[PDB]
Every structure is written in C-alpha cells, then in structure tokens.
Amino acid sequence: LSDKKASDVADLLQKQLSTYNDLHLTLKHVHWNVVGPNEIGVHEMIDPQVELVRGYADEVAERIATLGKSPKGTPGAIIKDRTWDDYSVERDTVQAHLAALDLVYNGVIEDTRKSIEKLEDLDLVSQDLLIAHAGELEKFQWFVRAHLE
Amino acid sequence: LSDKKASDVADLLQKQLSTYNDLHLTLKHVHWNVVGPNEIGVHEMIDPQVELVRGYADEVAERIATLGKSPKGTPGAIIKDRTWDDYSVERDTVQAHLAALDLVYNGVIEDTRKSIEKLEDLDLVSQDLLIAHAGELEKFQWFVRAHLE
Amino acid sequence: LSDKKASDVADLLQKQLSTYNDLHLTLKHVHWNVVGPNEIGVHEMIDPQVELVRGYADEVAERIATLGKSPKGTPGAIIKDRTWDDYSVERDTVQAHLAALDLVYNGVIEDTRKSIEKLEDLDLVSQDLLIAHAGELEKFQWFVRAHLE
Amino acid sequence: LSDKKASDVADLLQKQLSTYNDLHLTLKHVHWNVVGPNEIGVHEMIDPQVELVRGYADEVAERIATLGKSPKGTPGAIIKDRTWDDYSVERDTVQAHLAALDLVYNGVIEDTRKSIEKLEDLDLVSQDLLIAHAGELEKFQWFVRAHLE
Amino acid sequence: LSDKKASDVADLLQKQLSTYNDLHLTLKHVHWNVVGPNEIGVHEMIDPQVELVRGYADEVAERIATLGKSPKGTPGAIIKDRTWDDYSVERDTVQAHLAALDLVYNGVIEDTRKSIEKLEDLDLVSQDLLIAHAGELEKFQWFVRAHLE
Amino acid sequence: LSDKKASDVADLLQKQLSTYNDLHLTLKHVHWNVVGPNEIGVHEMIDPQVELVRGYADEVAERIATLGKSPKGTPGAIIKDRTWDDYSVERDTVQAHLAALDLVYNGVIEDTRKSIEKLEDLDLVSQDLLIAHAGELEKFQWFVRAHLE
Ligand SMILES: [Fe+2]
Ligand SMILES: [Fe+2]
Ligand SMILES: [Fe+2]
Ligand SMILES: [Fe+2]
Ligand SMILES: [Fe+2]
Ligand SMILES: [Fe+2]
C-alpha cells in the first residue's frame, strides 16, 4: 500500500504495542502487591486480563511485521512512547491499587481511542483491530470500577 | 530478620526483578522479529525461555513480598535499575539478533553473578534462589551461542 | 569426613531437629484451638504446614543418621535444645494465636538462620538443606502475617 | 454438665493428650534409629502405630474442646504431665530399642488404665474413649514383645 | 565470565567428571562380582546408584560445555585425574566388596568436598551442583555401611 | 572344562570386556562434545550404540563369571589391556569426531576379530558370542562412515 501512511500507521501501532507492554507489566505489578487472603477476588480478576493484554501486543506486533516494519517492545521503547505517569500508589491497599489501575485504563482507553481516530483515514484494517481491543479494555475497566464501589 | 539488610536485600532483588522483566520483554522482542520460515528453529527456542524468565520474576517478586517490601515491575523501574544498553541490532537477521541476545545474556548473567556475591553475607536464602536462576540462564546462553556457530 | 566437625554439625542439626518437632507440636496445638466456623481459613492454612514441617524433621533426622550419629526427637531433647519461650496465648482467639504463631516463626527462622551461618565453614551440604527449609518457613510466616492484617 | 468434674475430666484428658504426643514423638524417635536393612520388619511395624497414636491425640484434643477447655500439646505441657523417664537406650540395636519401647508402652498403658479408673465416676463417655485406645495400645505392645522374643 | 577462573573451574569439574566415570565403572565392577543368590539385596542396591552416578557425570559434562570447554571422559583422563588407588579386593565376598566400595566413597566424597571448597570463591553455581551430588553420594555410602554392619 | 584354556579364554574375554568399557566411555565422550543444533543427527546416532555396547560388556562380564573367574572393568584394567591410542581430536567439529570414532571402531573391530581367531581352538561358545558383537559393531561403523561422506 502507501509507503508514507505505512510509516504513519506503523508508528501509531508501535505506540499501541508499547501501551500494551506497559499495561501488562503494570498488571503484573498490581498483581504482585495485591496478593492477599481477603484480596483473592482481585488476584484472580487480574490473571485473565494479563494474558489477554499480552495477546493484544502479539496481534499488534504481528500486524506491524505484516506492514513491513519491525516491532519494538524493548523497555526503552515503552517509556519513550508512553503518555501518562508511572504507576504510583498513595497507599498499599486493595482499593488504592484498584483506583490506580482504573486511571491507567483511562489512560490506555484514551490513547487507543486516539489511535483509532487517527487511523480512520489511514488504515481501516488496523483500526478494526484496535476497535476490538477497546471494547474489551473498556469492559475490564468496568470490572475494576465495580469493585471500588 | 535484620531491618537494614532486609532493605539491602530487597533492593538487590528489586534490581533482579527488573533484570528479568527487561529480559523477557527483550525475549518477546527478539521473538517478534525473528519469526520467519527458515528461522523456525529459533522462534521455538525463545518460547520456553520467555515462560521460564517470567517465572523467575514471579519467584523474585514473591520473595520480595515475603521480606516485607513491595515489588516493582513497572516500566520506569526497569530503565532506572537497568545496567546495560537497550537492545539494538545492527541488522535484521537471525544471526544479528542471536548475537545481540548473546550479549544481553552476558549482561544478565554478570549482574546476577554480582547480586549473588553481594548476597553472600546478606541473605543466603535469596542467594540460593539466584544461584538456581543463573545455572539455567547460563544454560540458555549456551544454546544461543551454539546457534551463532 | 572430619570427626570433630561431624560432632559439631550433628549437634547443630540435632538442635534443628528439635526446632522442628517443637514447631509441629506447636502447629498441631494452634490447630486444635483455632478450629471454628469463621476460622476455617486458618484451620486449613495450618494443615499443609504441619505435614511439611514433619517432613523437614525427617530430612534432618535422616541427615544426622547419615553422618553417623543417632537422632533424638524425644520430648526431653526438645525443651533442652529449645531457645525461646513456650507457646503462651494472651487470649483464645484467631488473631491472638496467629500473632503468637508469627512470633514462634520469628524464633524458628532466627535459629535456622543461625545454624546456617554456623555451618558456612562446617558443612555446606547440611547448610543447603537448611537454606531450603528457611525459604519455605519464611514463606509460611508471610501467610500468617498477611492474615493478622 | 458439672463445672468441677469437667475441670477434673479435662485435666485427666489433658494428661492423656500429653501421653500421646510423648508416645508418638518417641515412636518417631525409635523409628529414626532403627532404620536398617535387616530391621525392615520393624521400621514398617512402627509406621502404622505412629499414625494411629497421632489419631488418638486428635480424638482426645477434640474431646477436650468439646468439654469447653482448650487442648495443650506444646512441648512444655508434655514434660510437665509426663510420668515416667525419657526414652534412654543402653545400646543402639533393634532389640534394645524394642525392649525400651516395650517399657514405654508399659508406662502408657498403666497411666491410661489409671485415667480410665479415675473416670469411672466422673465421665463414662471420655472413659469409653480411653478404653478403646487401651485395647489397641495393649495390642501393639504385644507385637513389640513378640519381636523381642 | 572470567576467562582464568573459567579455566580453573573447568579443570575442577573435569576432575569431578572423571571421579564419576571412575565411580560408575567401579560400581558396575562391584555389581558384576557380587551377583549371587544370597547377595540379591546388594545387586539391587547398586543398580539405582549406577544410573544416578552416570546422571551426575552428564550434568557435569553439560556444565563444562556450558562454560565453553569440552568434556573429557576418556579412560586416559580418568587415571590421570584419579586420586586414590584402584579397586582392589582382599577377598571375593559380599562384605569385602562392600567394605571396598565404602572406601571408594570415602575417596569420592572427600574429593568432592574439596572441589566444593575450592569453588567457594570461583563459581557458586557449579558449587551448588556439586553440593547436591554430595548429599546423595554421602547418602548412598550410609546404605553400604549399614550393610557391612 | 579345561583349567588352562579357561584361563586363556578368561584373559581374552577380560580384554574384550575392557575394549567395551573403553568404547562406551569413548562413545559417551564423543556424545558430550558433539551435542549441537545441526549435529542432532549424530547425537541421536550415538545414543543406541552406547546402550548396545554397555550391553555387550554385561554379556562378556557374565560370561567370565560363568567360566569361574571374576570380571574386571575398573579404569586401571582398561588402560592396561587397551591396545590403541586414547581418543584425540585434531579439531572440535562433527566430522573430526566422526573420523576419530571411525578409527576407534577400526581398533575395536580388529581386536575383536583377533580374539575371535584366538578362540577358534579354545572356546567356540565364547567365540560365537564375539562373532555376534562384531556384526553389529561393524554395522555401526558403516553408519559413522556414511556420515563422514
Ligand atoms: Fe469487526
Ligand atoms: Fe557460601
Ligand atoms: Fe540448592
Ligand atoms: Fe462401669
Ligand atoms: Fe547453596
Ligand atoms: Fe558359529
């Protein structure tokens, strides 16, 4: 297809790839701190989301490689493309971490919604890929919110 | 046990935790670029090592939490504690990536050997944990080298 | 091997053997008092630890016999080698007993850490045996603490 | 039932609880020293008796808790309530240990027969519990004697 | 890692490799002479130890190859690195051969304990490998001694 | 049978026993150095031959014991009876090691052919035993040669 847009598209995806790696490192981080006896509801809530996100990265990576470029998911590439602030907690409790996760998902969902809009004129294939992820990410966020409450 | 050393130990482990997250992001990165038809030997070589490393992080994370501290595997924490340079390739080929991986393992094995020496007087439990990892990491490196050749 | 050290080693192990018998009598004691309907989490938490500790004694006993001496796990030998105070509770509740258990494990882990240090120059085999136990004992203590909280 | 006798009964049982813990530590002690190639008959003879005795303690402990008191099977409580002398051997052989075991069972059976007589007017339930144990303990002693011979 | 020590380590392992090949040729030798009807206890005692030792060599060989050197288990290399005297018997009986085996294990355990001490500053990985072997070798020796008796 | 020849026969077999132990130590040696990714054909070629040779030794050992003598497969006995030179390689490659193996088999097959001729007048039983081995040894050599090529 188009040699420029392919670069434009690849750079959007490449950012989304880093959004995911960032998220599933963060997911694995919240998982490690929230592992307690009354917190069993949550430690299990995170598990499938970790696997699901890692899967999303794999889809995006494979999509980048299909477009001709090479995927980057090295830690340098994550901080560089990363938009929002690192996962800080005010306190070490279940609800703090949930609240904090809730905001990371606000971050992820928002940047995704952005890449989707940017792709409207560039590549509707890669768009539909990201639209799919968003439904589920937005879905998981609901599950975190409903716990807070 | 001892309140200072526990901080000294935790900070050593915390670094090792980041060594691992860095490695298995890197492993997943080399995996994504080396996925080709004549490269099938390698794409499968990486697979078990990814899982194995993620497991190592989980052990270290759980060990940190046992000592009373909280594990950090957020992307910020990776670059901060990271010693060597980001995974750069000169070229996009199987042997370049192998060679590059080989050096990352030199990096990982060396910092691990260091944490092990530093722990000799601090915490022989956490040491034996890391000694175990090293045998296998050093083992996998051999497998990468033997391919180069 | 060396005829003196073997006596030095045997006497260290023999103490560890008594640490274990003391612990799994204590574990079985806390188990018997904490057996209540809202306390089901805990009565089941203790079960595997009892079996695991009895196993540790069996390893140590068998190690003593391998070194040429005879193991002693008679009740006299337990009080004699025992370092810390008998398991007293302030009150008969779940959290009192947990708190009390937590401190017994502080006791056990500390004496073990000691035998490990003393064995650094004497017998690295018997050391590695005890290093292994410590990781798990320290692990179980975490599980008790996380309940208190 | 009666508030005094319940204290009288509990204190009898509590002693029996300690008789058992003492016995199955002793059983596990004789087991550890008698583990040899021509001694295979015996190392296997002990095994089921250990499990059986630990079971007896569990019955007695649970009976104490049913009467309202709390069971004590801590090592201090064993030496305190213990009547006869600690398990000493003249020599380290199969028949010495058997002979020594034989006498410990004389000790156990005699104190049990006592608690049974004392309970004749106090609590026929707890009595029947102990009468049952005695038949089997007396049975196992026979098996030890028949080996000596 | 370090280019000298790697040579120092390799030469220690290489000696241990030869200790093992020497042992499991010796084990297979004692096995062949002790194969009699009343000697069935022993002919079966040796069997698992042969397999276990051959396994030890394979671990050490593979460890040497991991360090970059090439393993040598040719018969020349065995006599050269061998410390103690060849397996001579005074008489052809079960107990002579056991006694003789007992001393070979004294030899093996002692040289292993040595390589372990020498490795304390050189390579704690390869050390832990040898510490593991020693526990079991020392264990098997016990089984031989307990037969003599 | 005949008291001298039995000594003559035993000493021929005893040499063949050492030929085998020498070979399957050598086989296990070539196996350890040739374990590489493109070398998978070979690492698997060696495996069954190792087992097969160890089996040959067991047959010969058992045959010696049947004739009244005692088998010797100690490392001293191997170098003493050994005819040809120790397994040296010019280089560490697959084809060098094959070539080197090829020559060891020339050595083994030749000494076997000799023991067979020497046994023509001494013991046709033990001969037929060795004739059998030769067919297969000569067979395996073919497989090594066909690889070189
Ligand atoms: Fe769709
Ligand atoms: Fe050490
Ligand atoms: Fe270990
Ligand atoms: Fe009655
Ligand atoms: Fe260790
Ligand atoms: Fe024939």
From Swiss-Prot, chains A, B, C, D, E, F:
Catalytic reactions on record: 2 Fe(2+) + H2O2 + 2 H(+) = 2 Fe(3+) + 2 H2O
Gene Ontology biological process: intracellular iron ion homeostasis
Binding locations of Fe cation 2: 62
Gene Ontology molecular function, alphabetical: DNA binding; ferric iron binding; oxidoreductase activity, acting on metal ions
Induction section of the entry: Expressed preferentially under carbon starvation.
GO cellular component, one term: nucleoid
Record's keyword terms, sorted: Cytoplasm, DNA-binding, Iron, Iron storage, Metal-binding, Oxidoreductase
Family: Belongs to the Dps family.
The protein, known as: DNA protection during starvation protein
Organism: Mycolicibacterium smegmatis (strain ATCC 700084 / mc(2)155) (Mycobacterium smegmatis)
This protein's encoding gene: dps
